[PDB]
């Protein structure tokens, strides 16, 4: 079941309050995983981490294991769960 894996959708629990959410696309082993976002619609910067401290949440998507940002981003415009997803929040710059 998806947990730790392709499908489930996880978040920046602490760091930012919440403003990047981020779905596994790439397991290397039970700590090393790669998590990454869509491309052209959130801007989310992929990156392959040993689980420092990322906790998923309940949604899921639903897509295979051994998926690409082409894939994600069909498959998630389809599902209606694009904008969720695209929504930004403190994306506040440091000066302005």
């Not at 894996?5 to 309050?17: D, H, Q, W, Y």
């Not at 995983?33 to 949604?59: A, F, M, S």
């Not at 294991?65 to 904008?83: F, M, P, Q, Y």
């Amino acid at each position: 079941m998806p947990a730790i894996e392709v499908g489930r959708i996880c978040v920046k629990v602490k760091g930012r309050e919440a403003g990047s959410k981020c779905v596994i696309v790439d397991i290397i082993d039970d700590n090393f995983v790669l998590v990454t976002g869509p491309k052209d619609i959130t801007g989310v910067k992929r990156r392959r981490v040993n689980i420092l401290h990322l906790e998923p949440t309940d949604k899921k998507i639903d897509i295979q294991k051994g998926a690409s940002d082409e894939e994600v981003k069909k498959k998630l415009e389809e599902s209606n769960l694009t904008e969720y997803m695209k929504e930004k929040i403190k994306i506040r710059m440091p000066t302005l």
